[PDB]
Design a protein around this ligand. Sequence first.
Ligand code: PGT
Ligand code: PTY
Ligand code: NDP
Ligand code: SF4
Ligand code: SF4
Ligand code: SF4
Lengths: 80, 316, 165, 112, 324, 181, 94, 157, 385
Amino acid sequence: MRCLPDGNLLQTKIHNIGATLVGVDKFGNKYYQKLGDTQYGRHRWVEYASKDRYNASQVPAEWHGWLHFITDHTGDELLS
Amino acid sequence: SGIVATVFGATGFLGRYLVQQLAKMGSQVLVPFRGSEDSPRHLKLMGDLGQVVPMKFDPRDEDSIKAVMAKANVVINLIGREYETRNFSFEDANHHIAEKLALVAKEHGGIMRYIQVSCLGASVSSPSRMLRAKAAAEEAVLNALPEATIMRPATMIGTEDRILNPWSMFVKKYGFLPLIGGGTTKFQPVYVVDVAAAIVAALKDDGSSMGKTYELGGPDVFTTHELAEIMYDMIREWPRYVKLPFPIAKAMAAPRDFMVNKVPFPLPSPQIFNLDQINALTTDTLVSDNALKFQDLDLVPHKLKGYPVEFLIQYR
Amino acid sequence: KDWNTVFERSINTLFLTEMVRGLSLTLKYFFDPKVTINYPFEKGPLSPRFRGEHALRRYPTGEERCIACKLCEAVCPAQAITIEAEEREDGSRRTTRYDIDMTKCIYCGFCQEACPVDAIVEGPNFEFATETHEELLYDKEKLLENGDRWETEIAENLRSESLYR
Amino acid sequence: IGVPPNSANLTEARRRVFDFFRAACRSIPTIMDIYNLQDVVAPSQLRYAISAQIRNNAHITDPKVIDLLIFKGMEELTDIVDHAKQRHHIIGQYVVGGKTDFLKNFYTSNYF
Amino acid sequence: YIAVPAEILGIILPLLLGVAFLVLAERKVMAFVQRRKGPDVVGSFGLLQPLADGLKLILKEPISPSSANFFLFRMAPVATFMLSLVAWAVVPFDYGMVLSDLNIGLLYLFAISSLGVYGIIIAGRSSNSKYAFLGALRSAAQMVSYEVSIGLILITVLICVGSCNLSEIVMAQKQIWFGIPLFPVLVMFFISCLAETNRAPFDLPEAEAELVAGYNVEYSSMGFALFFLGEYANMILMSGLCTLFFLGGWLPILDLPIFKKIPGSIWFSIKVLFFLFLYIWVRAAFPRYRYDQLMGLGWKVFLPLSLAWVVSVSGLLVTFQWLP
Amino acid sequence: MDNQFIFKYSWETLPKKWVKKMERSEHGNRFDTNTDYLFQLLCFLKLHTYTRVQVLIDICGVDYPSRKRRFEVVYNLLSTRYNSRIRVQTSADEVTRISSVVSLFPSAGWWEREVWDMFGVSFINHPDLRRILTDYGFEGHPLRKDFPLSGYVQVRYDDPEKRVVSEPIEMTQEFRYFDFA
Amino acid sequence: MMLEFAPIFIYLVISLLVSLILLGVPFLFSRFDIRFYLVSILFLIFDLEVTFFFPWAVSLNKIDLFGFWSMMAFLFILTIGFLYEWKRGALDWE
Amino acid sequence: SKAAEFVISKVDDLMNWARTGSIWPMTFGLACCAVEMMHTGAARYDLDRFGIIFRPSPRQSDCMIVAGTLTNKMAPALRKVYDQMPEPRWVISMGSCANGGGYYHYSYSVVRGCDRIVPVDIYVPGCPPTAEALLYGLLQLQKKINRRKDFLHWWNK
Amino acid sequence: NFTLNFGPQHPAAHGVLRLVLEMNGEVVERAEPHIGLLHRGTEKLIEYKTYLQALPYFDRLDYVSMMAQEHAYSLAVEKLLNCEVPLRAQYIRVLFCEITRILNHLLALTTHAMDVGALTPFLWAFEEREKLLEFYERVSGARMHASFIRPGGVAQDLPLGLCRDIDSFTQQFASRIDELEEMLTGNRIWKQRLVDIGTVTAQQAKDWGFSGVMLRGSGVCWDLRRAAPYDVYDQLDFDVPVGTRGDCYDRYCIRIEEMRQSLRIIVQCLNQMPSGMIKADDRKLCPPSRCRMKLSMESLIHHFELYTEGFSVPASSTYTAVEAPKGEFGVFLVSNGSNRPYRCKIRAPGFAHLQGLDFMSKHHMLADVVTIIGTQDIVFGEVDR
Ligand SMILES: CCCCCCCCCCCCCCCCCC(=O)O[C@@H](COC(=O)CCCCCCCCCCCCCCC)COP(=O)(O)OC[C@H](O)CO
Ligand SMILES: CCCCCCCCCCCCCCCCCCCC(=O)O[C@H](COC(=O)CCCCCCCCCCCCCC)COP(=O)(O)OCCN
Ligand SMILES: NC(=O)C1=CN([C@@H]2O[C@H](COP(=O)(O)OP(=O)(O)OC[C@H]3O[C@@H](n4cnc5c(N)ncnc54)[C@H](OP(=O)(O)O)[C@@H]3O)[C@@H](O)[C@H]2O)C=CC1
Ligand code: SF4
Ligand code: SF4
Ligand code: SF4
């Protein structure tokens, strides 16, 4: 129901359709990828655990590099 | 300076000038505010980084009060209101809060200097209920803190004053200016900057200001008609005074005072037809010859004409 | 010059023929996919070299890397670093004070280049806007907290970039 | 209009001084209006301040120094008139509108 | 007459909603041409953006600068907004779907258009600002200039129809839409509508970056919103007028039972939507003229062509006796 | 047109009293001249068929406090005709006006204003010589070596006056001079 | 019949009321350029031309050839005036 | 007052939703930071999609972005423009120059932080901050606006 | 005559642009720019910095063409030091200079177009700008102020895979240029806004010190990359477009063509890029590797010296100029033998170009002033310093 007032979250729900779950972090944020080519193959995004009051600073360090295409290592591989 | 001052009521007219002057002397200023965080925003530019610190408090709550006071050795109270709201009466706004602040300062233990700002006409036998509550608060603070200092400025003049600005607004919106008492009451209006300077000077002395009340009046004595004329020379407009006798003015100021404590929603504040101020206009409010003036603080107050009234340029 | 060319010029002027091509290729982009990033769920690409928020690092033992050589303070083009140092109780050469004024800093990375022990780095964080100027005056403890928070990414980036520097 | 050559001697430099003083004095009403000084200071006090500034440099004997002082005075007058920075008791560089000095300075600080 | 206010509200309120969403549609189409998204956060697909912007505007403190024209300054946006609203009283959306079936409706629309200039002029003069005054003068001159061509094109349609009644103008196109034989006249009418509504490539008030201050620069809060709303309502009205005069109003494309199934109001709406899309598209496609260039176009190009079309249509219809 | 030809031809053709010093170096050909001949030298170089120095690239001052004439004014010029650059320099002090070259090169107008603003050197026959970079009412000439880096005054908003105002500077943390010499 | 003008008046009253509500709710919480005169004059002339066109346009079926040519003569006079304005530079804003 | 507080909080939530959903900044584009700000408004980040529309006149603006170095010569112009902004209004300081003077801190001609001239609500660090950093700063502004309780504070005043 | 005071306090028209115009109706009689609103004392600050600490000031002058000014300053320092730069570094420098030229021309063209009301090309061009900013960030870790080009060469070598991505960009950039052109070049409104606006004769251009596109628009074939070549420009094929009318339209066309030629140069640099060192090998002026400094005394000592005192430059003085995207950008550097510049005079083309606004805008309409400002390509960081 958050989709109706929050259009930003709606776009993520739409683009999650057909996506692959890559992992979940300690805060419950979920990480998805597509493996296509629309934004030059950049298809990584995060669904924040809190559907309201989400904030970019909630991405932990182990997943920050993966989210920003700095590294191809997921948060799980970095933690191991 | 190593002075840490908690200035209550610093989001009003006199507060900005007082905070500017306290920051000039290097003091750290704490600014308790009761509502929106944007109310003390204009004070943040004053002083260096970290020097002015606004802090949320509640008046009707003792914990918040000692919380904002917990770090200070100087407390200045400017809280007051010349009208009434359904939430705060004249005695609630002008006597109860001041007594509570004095009591918390007593239980604090560390307040070296306490300054309570009052009004010049503050007396028990005053027509204005606000002035009566002001005198009561003066007595209450003195009883709770015999070493406290009391300031009694006259009507203050400045960019955000509540006398010349309402007059200019009313004239520019109607074309004429009423005179409530035939334009005969005398009062010595005072530059707000001078009041701030007197407070700073009493904070700076070798201790001689403690226990004493100072009557701060402007250099000159005027009639309300005489001030209305400085306003017209400055606003470059054609004067047109209309005599409103006291019972008529009280009639036009009766509705708000009547229905303020009955209707359950806020009312707009009175500009000219405030009943209590009209009652105050019945008598003349002058600096007593036996009081302590701007002299005995080694200060000369500024004359109104020119710079104190330069904000009136905006109305031309 | 010739009736045909004059006629063709007149028609083209009257019928706004060249205005049609602009309309057409504006309309072509209308149906193509958009390049907008759905921030904050999606982010722009960055590199291991990205110069973001400074951080102070420790050895895996927990010991600080910084030995108060003051090279970063000397090289800093903005004079944004302030250091005090003394012999620690165990005899170690260590900072007592390490301040970076985040509002003077130009985020040039010179300090990270100057440091001989990889103690000060500009990490990958760029989302640290504040409500007060005083929160941007970083002291040593804040920088060490940054280092603890971002250590895994910083170490990965250093492993990646050690083959160029 | 253009920057004139340096004064050849003290006579022509004095003539330039008199011209500058006339131009400065004639601009006093404009300054009074711009800074709203009607109730702050008399126009003659402005004239007196300008003349006092001219007199404090009456010992100068080099025409080039006089020409430079006149040029700087013209620039300062132009900035005062064209690009006024209103303060209160201060226009440009001038303040408008029983113990010796040593004791006061000693009470003030250790840096005299 | 007791139910007349209900009809009037059933016109005015959906029109205000339509304007609020025309602003959003302009933003969306402009974005999509520019390979971006445009509003999509405030509400799903950005559909709550207009309500948020309107709420922000009503919650904004009004300024009302210390001018000597205190009454005129606030009344100018009221005048332009009311004029934008009242033209819809005579607009028919389908057969019998019209508030006022004026026999003189065409001339009434011309009169409203001629009245539109006063809000801009008064806003410029009353604001006590030389830049606003100059911009208002230029905008007013442009609108009066293109009003001449609009009136002459109106006369061409009137010659074809023989009645000033808008519904009669629609029903006279049952045989053929006037936009087919008079296609250049329709192009001229659309361009003149662009210029008359101060729209790109004729949007002088939008040319702040070109050192040309708009007439509404001193306005804030709801006076500025009133100017904006009147402008966009006038855009919708100009699209509706293009639909009525040249695309056969509520009529179907082909007189066939398959097309007659769908209601006439839907035909009218679809044509209006096409013209609004063209408004946005044109704003997305081209740079703007200078004031002098557009004035030259108004007087040197569109007036002579409009007059020539009047003469040619009347002469042809008189010659072969095809008059209504 | 190489720097050997320019040096030799200028020695052969220029009036002798115009040039006090001539340097030929890969760092640039350089002519030093008294202030009273600067204008005529530049006019010659611009007009003469074998030089055609048509572009004035810039004018700048350099402060040398140890010198009786502390200021050195440098003219960088270009010949697009011969694809060559020339530097012409003259010295000046705090009170001696030098000739403007605006009538020769209109581009000089603002560069001269800048020299006056930054260093305090004045230019005879300059049509409009006022400061161009500093704040209105600025005092001093910031590029002089004795002018302090942070200056003498700073500005802040003053709520009681409802305006931005200027006060003598006060530095929270002073500029630290690191002497590595 | 003039009956159809009454809804227009009621519409005006309602639109005015909407305007006042919208505008009033936030109060709770020396260089003469002759070319403008000239463009005004031209607009006046062609405004009257449109005015005279209206009855002619609705009356063409009854006035036939005589009315057509009389209006043509009217237009010829006005267009000679327009040519005069064009040649004199009244239509140039540069 | 078990019913008045709920309605008051709902009103304040509506006001905050409106004010966060339509932020109309005026840009004070002074130096290099203005280029990153232009990129934030461009297609990749599309400030339009958050309801953020840039206005030419302070009269139609709710926010001022100070993007670049503020000189002493420019300070009066910045303050006057700020004083024409109608309430409620916010200021975002973008980049080291606007934050505290940055690389020019010790210069004779530079204001050492725009917060000496106007009250600042959000400081965005960087030289320049990335376009995404500016977007993060604008989301922090939304967070600050969402703590407002204007209706409640006025009811109790 | 009336006086219109125009200051756009927003980057729509610069941002610190301030103009006093005298008008006769809508006709401009005199245009007087008031500058210094971004004067930050750069030339004074530089004298208090070591030669390395001074380098970031040059990114912030024409802050749309960052690496070009970096390059000019490095070249001046190299000239005074007699320092030899390795070939690979030369090629990287030229490659980044031409990327910068494209970055500058896209911004200039589309901001001008938006000023005269064409909104879409700005968005289209800024996406390509974003791709080029990504190359800046991949090599330096900064989108704009890279401080990547340095005395002796470049700060770091290219990351693996960068050349391939640049090649991918070049394979599609010509279509983007074509789209911009079809939007603008043939459009009658665009021509009416630019043809015969701001005409400049060759004599006027020389008299007012014009350079770059401002000079080549008037028919003067002059490009420092060919007249006074530096780095590897003499090994590269490119054409120098020149105008025939000297107006705004000619300069727009020249900028489009310059983007095409820059694309050509980038392709050549990509194909001819050699292997080897990216820093000068003289061990008295360049930082050692991190591993060398952690392993070798001599290296550690040199690192300590370089990052505390910086290198010395023997006493001398010279003027060095490059063909920046906005025209001739020059540095007059005076060294006294110490580790800090004694004097650094910066010669900005925008200073000359904006001074020419008075004669260029004479007798034009008010709306042409912004067009003329746009064709000059003014950035006040370099005008004011
Ligand atoms: C911008 C366009 C400019 C057009 C300029 C060219 C035309 C100007 C008008 C010139 C006068 C008419 C020239 C056309 C010749 C054909 C006339 C014709 O066909 O004869 C018809 C008759 O045409 C006329 O007689 C009309 C003449 C028009 C009046 C022109 C004025 C001439 C002088 C008038 C003197 C009055 C004083 C002038 C005051 C200024 C026959 O009609 P009917 O008799 O069969 O029946 C009458 C009708 O059908 C039923 O109503
Ligand atoms: C189903 C689709 C329906 C679509 C309906 C709307 C169509 C779209 C309309 C909008 C199109 C884009 C609008 C933006 C362009 C505005 C700029 C117009 C500029 C302009 O008017 O130029 C004039 C020519 O155009 C003109 O003159 C325009 C009027 C043309 C009328 C044609 C007149 C003769 C036609 C032949 C008739 C013969 C048959 C009858 C016997 C000449 O001015 P200039 O200065 O620009 O010159 C330079 C010429 N390169
Ligand atoms: N002419 C004059 O101005 C004169 C005034 N005085 C007295 O001097 C003092 C300062 O004057 P001035 O600055 O003009 O006063 P203002 O009315 O301008 O400011 C009053 C201050 O007190 C605060 N305040 C008022 N009521 C309450 C309350 N119930 N709880 C908490 N805070 C409250 C206000 O807070 P908020 O902004 O949040 O409402 C504000 O900060 C007052 O005591 C006044 O009565 C003396 C003589 C004449
Ligand atoms: S990033 Fe540069 S300016 Fe900032 S602290 Fe590090 S060295 Fe100093
Ligand atoms: S951070 Fe590095 S360079 Fe700076 S003092 Fe510590 S060890 Fe030295
Ligand atoms: S903070 Fe950095 S990028 Fe921003 S204006 Fe200042 S120097 Fe330029």
